[PDB]
Protein backbone atom coordinates (compact mmCIF):
# COMPACT_ATOMS: atom_id res chain seq x y z
CA UNK A 1 0.00 0.00 0.00
CA UNK A 2 1.80 3.05 -1.39
CA UNK A 3 5.21 1.85 -0.18
CA UNK A 4 7.39 -0.21 2.14
CA UNK A 5 6.41 -1.10 5.70
CA UNK A 6 8.52 0.16 8.60
CA UNK A 7 6.80 -1.17 11.75
CA UNK A 8 6.48 -4.77 12.92
CA UNK A 9 3.58 -5.85 15.11
CA UNK A 10 4.71 -7.94 18.05
CA UNK A 11 2.40 -10.86 17.25
CA UNK A 12 3.73 -10.79 13.68
CA UNK A 13 7.36 -11.17 14.79
CA UNK A 14 9.13 -14.47 14.08
CA UNK A 15 8.41 -17.19 16.61
CA UNK A 16 12.09 -18.02 17.22
CA UNK A 17 12.77 -14.64 18.87
CA UNK A 18 10.92 -15.64 22.08
CA UNK A 19 9.16 -12.31 22.44
CA UNK A 20 6.71 -11.94 25.30
CA UNK A 21 3.11 -11.16 24.45
CA UNK A 22 2.54 -8.12 26.67
CA UNK A 23 5.70 -5.98 26.63
CA UNK A 24 4.30 -3.66 23.96
CA UNK A 25 2.51 -3.35 20.66
CA UNK A 26 5.59 -3.52 18.42
CA UNK A 27 8.70 -5.64 17.86
CA UNK A 28 12.04 -4.58 16.35
CA UNK A 29 11.76 -4.63 12.59
CA UNK A 30 15.09 -6.01 11.31
CA UNK A 31 16.80 -3.77 8.79
CA UNK A 32 17.53 -4.66 5.21
CA UNK A 33 20.81 -6.53 4.99
CA UNK A 34 22.57 -9.86 4.57
CA UNK A 35 19.72 -12.06 5.88
CA UNK A 36 15.99 -12.41 5.36
CA UNK A 37 13.73 -10.51 7.73
CA UNK A 38 12.08 -13.72 8.89
CA UNK A 39 15.28 -15.78 9.21
CA UNK A 40 17.45 -13.14 10.92
CA UNK A 41 18.06 -12.11 14.53
CA UNK A 42 18.22 -8.34 15.08
CA UNK A 43 21.05 -7.28 17.35
CA UNK A 44 18.77 -5.48 19.82
CA UNK A 45 17.06 -8.81 20.48
CA UNK A 46 20.38 -10.62 20.90
CA UNK A 47 21.87 -8.08 23.32
CA UNK A 48 18.68 -7.41 25.31
CA UNK A 49 16.57 -10.57 25.48
CA UNK A 50 19.33 -13.18 25.13
CA UNK A 51 22.46 -11.82 26.82
CA UNK A 52 20.43 -9.59 29.17
CA UNK A 53 23.26 -7.03 29.06
CA UNK A 54 20.97 -4.15 28.15
CA UNK A 55 17.79 -3.55 30.11
CA UNK A 56 15.95 -1.73 27.30
CA UNK A 57 16.38 -0.54 23.73
CA UNK A 58 17.81 2.85 24.65
CA UNK A 59 20.63 1.07 26.47
CA UNK A 60 21.16 -1.05 23.36
CA UNK A 61 21.71 2.18 21.46
CA UNK A 62 24.01 3.48 24.20
CA UNK A 63 26.08 0.29 23.92
CA UNK A 64 26.32 0.19 20.13
CA UNK A 65 27.18 3.86 19.62
CA UNK A 66 30.50 3.19 21.38
CA UNK A 67 31.78 0.72 18.75
CA UNK A 68 31.40 -2.22 21.16
CA UNK A 69 29.46 -4.57 18.88
CA UNK A 70 30.94 -6.25 15.79
CA UNK A 71 29.40 -8.68 13.31
CA UNK A 72 31.77 -10.59 11.01
CA UNK A 73 34.63 -8.41 12.17
CA UNK A 74 32.94 -5.08 11.41
CA UNK A 75 31.48 -2.53 13.81
CA UNK A 76 27.74 -2.01 13.30
CA UNK A 77 25.84 0.99 14.64
CA UNK A 78 22.45 -0.41 13.52
CA UNK A 79 20.30 -1.37 16.51
CA UNK A 80 18.24 -3.58 14.17
CA UNK A 81 20.99 -5.12 12.03
CA UNK A 82 19.82 -8.43 10.48
CA UNK A 83 22.28 -10.88 12.00
CA UNK A 84 21.68 -14.40 10.75
CA UNK A 85 23.03 -17.93 10.46
CA UNK A 86 26.81 -18.38 10.95
CA UNK A 87 27.26 -14.68 11.77
CA UNK A 88 30.07 -14.04 14.23
CA UNK A 89 29.22 -11.55 16.96
CA UNK A 90 32.16 -10.10 18.90
CA UNK A 91 32.08 -8.00 22.07
CA UNK A 92 35.59 -6.60 22.50
CA UNK A 93 35.14 -4.63 25.72
CA UNK A 94 33.98 -7.81 27.45
CA UNK A 95 36.36 -9.86 25.25
CA UNK A 96 33.64 -12.27 24.21
CA UNK A 97 32.70 -13.88 20.89
CA UNK A 98 29.47 -15.50 19.71
CA UNK A 99 28.17 -17.37 16.68
CA UNK A 100 24.49 -17.50 15.72
CA UNK A 101 23.81 -21.18 15.10
CA UNK A 102 20.43 -22.89 15.34
CA UNK A 103 19.90 -25.32 18.18
CA UNK A 104 17.89 -28.53 17.90
CA UNK A 105 14.99 -26.54 19.38
CA UNK A 106 14.77 -24.23 16.36
CA UNK A 107 16.21 -21.09 17.96
CA UNK A 108 19.32 -18.96 17.64
CA UNK A 109 21.01 -20.24 20.77
CA UNK A 110 23.63 -18.15 22.54
CA UNK A 111 26.90 -19.88 21.65
CA UNK A 112 30.22 -18.68 23.04
CA UNK A 113 33.14 -19.39 20.71
CA UNK A 114 36.88 -18.95 21.01
CA UNK A 115 38.73 -16.01 19.48
CA UNK A 116 40.54 -18.25 16.98
CA UNK A 117 37.27 -19.67 15.66
CA UNK A 118 35.84 -16.14 15.65
CA UNK A 119 37.93 -15.39 12.57
CA UNK A 120 35.97 -17.07 9.75
CA UNK A 121 32.48 -18.27 8.87
CA UNK A 122 30.85 -20.89 6.68
CA UNK A 123 28.73 -19.94 3.70
CA UNK A 124 26.38 -21.92 1.48
CA UNK A 125 26.88 -21.24 -2.22
CA UNK A 126 23.63 -20.17 -3.89
CA UNK A 127 24.78 -19.55 -7.47
CA UNK A 128 27.83 -19.00 -9.66
CA UNK A 129 28.00 -17.02 -12.91
CA UNK A 130 30.28 -14.62 -14.74
CA UNK A 131 30.11 -10.91 -14.03
CA UNK A 132 31.47 -7.90 -15.86
CA UNK A 133 34.74 -8.49 -17.75
CA UNK A 134 34.14 -12.24 -17.78
CA UNK A 135 34.94 -12.59 -14.06
CA UNK A 136 33.10 -15.46 -12.31
CA UNK A 137 31.76 -15.15 -8.78
CA UNK A 138 29.74 -17.10 -6.23
CA UNK A 139 27.03 -15.83 -3.89
CA UNK A 140 26.76 -17.13 -0.34
CA UNK A 141 23.62 -17.33 1.78
CA UNK A 142 24.41 -13.97 3.45
CA UNK A 143 24.53 -11.94 0.26
CA UNK A 144 28.32 -12.09 0.06
CA UNK A 145 29.86 -12.15 -3.41
CA UNK A 146 33.41 -13.44 -3.91
CA UNK A 147 35.21 -12.93 -7.20
CA UNK A 148 37.54 -15.55 -8.68
CA UNK A 149 36.27 -18.64 -6.83
CA UNK A 150 37.67 -22.13 -7.31
CA UNK A 151 36.55 -23.56 -10.69
CA UNK A 152 35.01 -26.52 -8.84
CA UNK A 153 32.69 -24.57 -6.52
CA UNK A 154 29.04 -25.14 -7.45
CA UNK A 155 25.63 -24.54 -5.91
CA UNK A 156 24.85 -25.92 -2.44
CA UNK A 157 28.56 -26.23 -1.68
CA UNK A 158 29.93 -24.56 1.44
CA UNK A 159 32.94 -22.24 1.43
CA UNK A 160 35.05 -21.26 4.44
CA UNK A 161 35.19 -17.46 4.38
CA UNK A 162 38.04 -15.58 6.04
CA UNK A 163 36.43 -12.62 7.80
CA UNK A 164 39.43 -10.28 7.75
CA UNK A 165 39.92 -10.52 3.98
CA UNK A 166 36.60 -11.88 2.70
CA UNK A 167 38.46 -14.54 0.71
CA UNK A 168 37.71 -18.25 0.36
CA UNK A 169 39.94 -20.50 2.46
CA UNK A 170 38.56 -23.90 1.42
CA UNK A 171 35.28 -25.47 0.35
CA UNK A 172 33.26 -28.66 0.86
CA UNK A 173 31.66 -30.56 -2.00
CA UNK A 174 27.99 -31.54 -1.71
CA UNK A 175 27.77 -35.33 -1.96
CA UNK A 176 26.66 -38.43 -0.08
CA UNK A 177 28.14 -38.75 3.39
CA UNK A 178 28.55 -35.05 4.15
CA UNK A 179 27.91 -33.62 7.61
CA UNK A 180 25.04 -31.15 7.22
CA UNK A 181 22.71 -29.02 9.30
CA UNK A 182 19.07 -28.29 8.50
CA UNK A 183 18.36 -24.56 8.16
CA UNK A 184 14.59 -24.67 7.63
CA UNK A 185 11.36 -26.51 8.22
CA UNK A 186 10.35 -28.85 11.01
CA UNK A 187 13.88 -30.25 11.39
CA UNK A 188 15.47 -26.84 12.01
CA UNK A 189 18.80 -27.17 13.78
CA UNK A 190 19.31 -30.94 13.63
CA UNK A 191 22.70 -32.20 12.47
CA UNK A 192 23.01 -35.34 10.36
CA UNK A 193 24.76 -37.01 7.43
CA UNK A 194 23.69 -37.15 3.79
CA UNK A 195 22.32 -40.57 2.81
CA UNK A 196 20.57 -40.07 -0.53
CA UNK A 197 19.72 -36.99 -2.58
CA UNK A 198 16.51 -37.41 -4.56
CA UNK A 199 16.04 -35.28 -7.68
CA UNK A 200 12.79 -33.94 -9.14
CA UNK A 201 13.23 -31.81 -12.25
CA UNK A 202 11.12 -28.67 -12.26
CA UNK A 203 10.04 -29.41 -8.70
CA UNK A 204 11.80 -29.87 -5.39
CA UNK A 205 14.90 -31.83 -4.43
CA UNK A 206 14.62 -33.96 -1.29
CA UNK A 207 17.61 -34.95 0.83
CA UNK A 208 17.56 -38.02 3.07
CA UNK A 209 19.58 -37.42 6.25
CA UNK A 210 20.54 -39.53 9.27
CA UNK A 211 21.52 -38.50 12.81
CA UNK A 212 24.30 -39.99 14.91
CA UNK A 213 21.46 -41.88 16.53
CA UNK A 214 20.23 -43.75 13.46
CA UNK A 215 17.00 -41.93 12.64
CA UNK A 216 16.43 -41.01 9.00
CA UNK A 217 14.65 -37.74 8.21
CA UNK A 218 14.10 -36.10 4.82
CA UNK A 219 14.26 -32.39 4.07
CA UNK A 220 14.12 -30.00 1.12
CA UNK A 221 17.49 -29.35 -0.52
CA UNK A 222 16.94 -25.63 0.09
CA UNK A 223 17.02 -26.21 3.86
CA UNK A 224 20.29 -28.19 3.89
CA UNK A 225 23.59 -26.59 4.92
CA UNK A 226 26.89 -28.45 4.49
CA UNK A 227 28.86 -28.01 7.72
CA UNK A 228 31.46 -30.78 7.77
CA UNK A 229 33.36 -33.22 5.62
CA UNK A 230 32.32 -36.40 7.45
CA UNK A 231 30.45 -37.58 10.53
CA UNK A 232 31.59 -35.97 13.77
CA UNK A 233 34.01 -33.47 12.17
CA UNK A 234 32.36 -30.10 11.51
CA UNK A 235 34.33 -26.98 10.63
CA UNK A 236 32.51 -24.89 13.27
CA UNK A 237 31.72 -25.35 16.95
CA UNK A 238 28.32 -26.94 17.65
CA UNK A 239 25.71 -25.74 20.16
CA UNK A 240 25.33 -27.46 23.52
CA UNK A 241 23.33 -30.48 22.39
CA UNK A 242 25.27 -31.52 19.27
CA UNK A 243 22.16 -31.07 17.10
CA UNK A 244 20.45 -34.26 18.32
CA UNK A 245 16.69 -34.61 18.74
CA UNK A 246 15.28 -36.14 21.92
CA UNK A 247 11.76 -37.35 22.53
CA UNK A 248 9.70 -35.58 25.19
CA UNK A 249 10.12 -38.55 27.53
CA UNK A 250 13.90 -38.44 27.06
CA UNK A 251 14.12 -34.74 27.88
CA UNK A 252 11.89 -35.25 30.92
CA UNK A 253 14.19 -38.04 32.09
CA UNK A 254 17.33 -35.95 31.58
CA UNK A 255 15.81 -32.95 33.37
CA UNK A 256 14.88 -35.18 36.31
CA UNK A 257 18.36 -36.70 36.13
CA UNK A 258 20.13 -33.36 36.51
CA UNK A 259 17.56 -31.88 38.94
CA UNK A 260 16.64 -35.00 40.94
Amino acid sequence: ARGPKKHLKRLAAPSHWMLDKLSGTYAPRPSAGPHKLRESLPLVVFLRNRLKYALNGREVKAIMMQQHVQVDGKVRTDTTYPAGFMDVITLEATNEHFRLVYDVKGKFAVHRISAEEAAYKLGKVKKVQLGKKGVPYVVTHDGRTIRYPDPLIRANDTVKIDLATGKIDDFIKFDTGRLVMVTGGRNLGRVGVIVHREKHEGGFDLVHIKDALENTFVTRLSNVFVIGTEAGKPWVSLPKGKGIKLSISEERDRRRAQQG
Binding site: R10, L11, K21, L22, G24, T25, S247, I248, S249, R252
Partner: protein, 178 residues
Protein backbone atom coordinates in the same frame (compact mmCIF):
# COMPACT_ATOMS: atom_id res chain seq x y z
CA UNK B 1 -2.64 -2.60 20.04
CA UNK B 2 -1.23 -4.96 22.64
CA UNK B 3 -2.09 -8.64 22.30
CA UNK B 4 -5.20 -9.84 24.17
CA UNK B 5 -4.71 -11.64 27.47
CA UNK B 6 -6.48 -14.97 27.88
CA UNK B 7 -9.25 -15.42 30.43
CA UNK B 8 -11.57 -18.35 31.11
CA UNK B 9 -14.49 -19.30 33.31
CA UNK B 10 -13.71 -21.86 36.02
CA UNK B 11 -17.18 -23.32 36.70
CA UNK B 12 -20.53 -24.23 35.18
CA UNK B 13 -24.03 -24.05 36.67
CA UNK B 14 -26.24 -27.18 36.52
CA UNK B 15 -28.49 -27.86 33.55
CA UNK B 16 -31.48 -28.50 35.84
CA UNK B 17 -31.76 -25.68 38.40
CA UNK B 18 -34.15 -27.44 40.82
CA UNK B 19 -33.28 -31.10 41.34
CA UNK B 20 -33.88 -31.55 45.06
CA UNK B 21 -31.57 -34.53 45.66
CA UNK B 22 -28.48 -32.78 44.31
CA UNK B 23 -29.52 -29.55 46.06
CA UNK B 24 -29.39 -31.44 49.35
CA UNK B 25 -26.04 -32.96 48.34
CA UNK B 26 -24.56 -29.53 47.64
CA UNK B 27 -25.91 -28.17 50.92
CA UNK B 28 -24.31 -31.07 52.77
CA UNK B 29 -20.97 -30.49 51.04
CA UNK B 30 -21.01 -26.76 51.81
CA UNK B 31 -21.97 -27.40 55.43
CA UNK B 32 -19.30 -30.07 55.89
CA UNK B 33 -16.52 -27.99 54.35
CA UNK B 34 -17.70 -24.53 55.41
CA UNK B 35 -18.16 -23.09 51.91
CA UNK B 36 -19.57 -19.66 51.11
CA UNK B 37 -21.82 -20.39 48.11
CA UNK B 38 -22.78 -23.11 45.66
CA UNK B 39 -20.33 -21.76 43.06
CA UNK B 40 -17.44 -23.09 45.15
CA UNK B 41 -18.88 -26.58 44.67
CA UNK B 42 -19.35 -25.83 40.96
CA UNK B 43 -15.66 -25.01 40.57
CA UNK B 44 -14.45 -28.29 42.04
CA UNK B 45 -17.04 -30.09 39.95
CA UNK B 46 -15.57 -28.35 36.90
CA UNK B 47 -12.02 -29.36 37.81
CA UNK B 48 -13.02 -32.95 38.56
CA UNK B 49 -14.99 -33.26 35.33
CA UNK B 50 -12.08 -32.07 33.20
CA UNK B 51 -9.61 -34.33 35.04
CA UNK B 52 -11.87 -37.35 34.52
CA UNK B 53 -12.31 -36.40 30.85
CA UNK B 54 -8.54 -36.27 30.36
CA UNK B 55 -8.09 -39.62 32.10
CA UNK B 56 -10.83 -41.18 29.96
CA UNK B 57 -9.31 -39.86 26.73
CA UNK B 58 -5.91 -41.24 27.69
CA UNK B 59 -7.50 -44.55 28.73
CA UNK B 60 -8.98 -44.99 25.26
CA UNK B 61 -5.34 -45.64 24.27
CA UNK B 62 -3.15 -48.69 24.63
CA UNK B 63 -0.84 -49.12 27.60
CA UNK B 64 1.98 -48.89 25.02
CA UNK B 65 0.80 -45.64 23.41
CA UNK B 66 3.46 -42.92 23.92
CA UNK B 67 0.88 -40.14 24.36
CA UNK B 68 -0.63 -42.07 27.26
CA UNK B 69 2.81 -42.79 28.72
CA UNK B 70 3.57 -39.07 28.80
CA UNK B 71 0.31 -37.24 29.54
CA UNK B 72 -1.26 -39.85 31.81
CA UNK B 73 1.85 -40.00 33.98
CA UNK B 74 2.00 -36.20 34.11
CA UNK B 75 -1.64 -36.19 35.25
CA UNK B 76 -0.92 -38.86 37.86
CA UNK B 77 2.08 -36.86 39.07
CA UNK B 78 0.01 -33.70 39.50
CA UNK B 79 -2.75 -35.58 41.32
CA UNK B 80 -0.43 -37.49 43.67
CA UNK B 81 1.57 -34.39 44.54
CA UNK B 82 -1.51 -32.39 45.64
CA UNK B 83 -2.85 -35.10 47.96
CA UNK B 84 -5.80 -36.39 45.93
CA UNK B 85 -4.09 -39.75 45.31
CA UNK B 86 -1.83 -41.83 47.54
CA UNK B 87 1.32 -43.80 46.64
CA UNK B 88 -0.63 -46.89 45.53
CA UNK B 89 -3.22 -45.73 42.94
CA UNK B 90 -1.13 -44.60 39.96
CA UNK B 91 -2.97 -46.20 37.04
CA UNK B 92 -5.55 -43.63 35.74
CA UNK B 93 -8.27 -46.02 36.87
CA UNK B 94 -8.33 -44.54 40.36
CA UNK B 95 -8.35 -41.13 38.69
CA UNK B 96 -11.90 -41.92 37.59
CA UNK B 97 -13.06 -42.62 41.15
CA UNK B 98 -12.22 -39.17 42.52
CA UNK B 99 -15.05 -37.22 44.15
CA UNK B 100 -15.43 -33.54 45.09
CA UNK B 101 -14.57 -34.33 48.70
CA UNK B 102 -11.13 -35.52 47.59
CA UNK B 103 -10.33 -31.97 46.49
CA UNK B 104 -12.28 -30.43 49.37
CA UNK B 105 -10.11 -32.38 51.82
CA UNK B 106 -6.96 -30.91 50.24
CA UNK B 107 -7.97 -27.27 50.68
CA UNK B 108 -6.22 -24.92 53.09
CA UNK B 109 -9.37 -24.55 55.21
CA UNK B 110 -9.97 -28.28 55.62
CA UNK B 111 -6.36 -28.99 56.53
CA UNK B 112 -6.27 -26.06 58.95
CA UNK B 113 -9.15 -27.42 60.97
CA UNK B 114 -7.80 -30.98 60.63
CA UNK B 115 -4.34 -30.17 62.00
CA UNK B 116 -5.81 -28.44 65.05
CA UNK B 117 -5.09 -24.78 64.37
CA UNK B 118 -8.82 -24.05 64.69
CA UNK B 119 -11.86 -25.63 66.32
CA UNK B 120 -14.57 -25.38 63.66
CA UNK B 121 -14.00 -25.31 59.93
CA UNK B 122 -15.74 -21.93 59.89
CA UNK B 123 -13.20 -20.66 62.42
CA UNK B 124 -10.50 -22.11 60.16
CA UNK B 125 -11.76 -20.10 57.18
CA UNK B 126 -12.06 -17.02 59.39
CA UNK B 127 -8.43 -17.38 60.50
CA UNK B 128 -7.28 -17.91 56.90
CA UNK B 129 -9.02 -14.74 55.74
CA UNK B 130 -7.50 -12.55 58.48
CA UNK B 131 -3.91 -13.49 57.48
CA UNK B 132 -3.19 -15.56 60.62
CA UNK B 133 -2.06 -18.60 58.58
CA UNK B 134 1.27 -19.03 56.83
CA UNK B 135 2.33 -21.87 54.54
CA UNK B 136 6.07 -22.07 54.83
CA UNK B 137 6.92 -18.49 55.76
CA UNK B 138 4.38 -17.16 53.23
CA UNK B 139 1.10 -15.81 54.58
CA UNK B 140 -1.84 -17.29 52.66
CA UNK B 141 -5.28 -15.69 52.90
CA UNK B 142 -6.93 -17.90 50.26
CA UNK B 143 -9.10 -20.72 51.69
CA UNK B 144 -9.16 -22.47 48.28
CA UNK B 145 -5.35 -22.60 48.31
CA UNK B 146 -4.64 -26.30 47.73
CA UNK B 147 -1.77 -27.61 49.86
CA UNK B 148 0.54 -30.19 48.28
CA UNK B 149 1.77 -33.35 50.01
CA UNK B 150 5.19 -31.76 50.48
CA UNK B 151 3.54 -28.73 52.07
CA UNK B 152 1.29 -30.26 54.74
CA UNK B 153 3.85 -30.25 57.57
CA UNK B 154 4.76 -26.56 57.17
CA UNK B 155 1.31 -25.14 57.95
CA UNK B 156 1.32 -23.10 61.17
CA UNK B 157 0.68 -19.58 62.42
CA UNK B 158 2.26 -16.38 61.16
CA UNK B 159 5.05 -14.79 63.19
CA UNK B 160 3.23 -11.44 63.28
CA UNK B 161 -0.13 -12.83 64.34
CA UNK B 162 -1.18 -12.82 68.01
CA UNK B 163 -1.58 -16.60 67.66
CA UNK B 164 1.98 -17.39 66.60
CA UNK B 165 4.35 -14.89 68.17
CA UNK B 166 3.05 -11.41 67.40
CA UNK B 167 1.86 -8.30 69.20
CA UNK B 168 -1.72 -7.52 70.25
CA UNK B 169 -4.53 -6.44 67.97
CA UNK B 170 -6.23 -3.09 68.35
CA UNK B 171 -8.92 -4.60 70.59
CA UNK B 172 -6.48 -5.84 73.22
CA UNK B 173 -4.33 -2.71 72.96
CA UNK B 174 -7.38 -0.58 73.75
CA UNK B 175 -8.56 -2.98 76.46
CA UNK B 176 -5.17 -3.05 78.21
CA UNK B 177 -5.30 0.69 78.91
CA UNK B 178 -7.10 0.01 82.19
Amino acid sequence: PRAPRTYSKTYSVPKRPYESARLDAELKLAGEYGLKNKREIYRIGFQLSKIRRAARDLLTRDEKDPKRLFEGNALIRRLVRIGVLSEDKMKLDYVLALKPEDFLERRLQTQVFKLGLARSIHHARVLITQRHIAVGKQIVNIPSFTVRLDSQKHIDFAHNSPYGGGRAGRVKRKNQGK
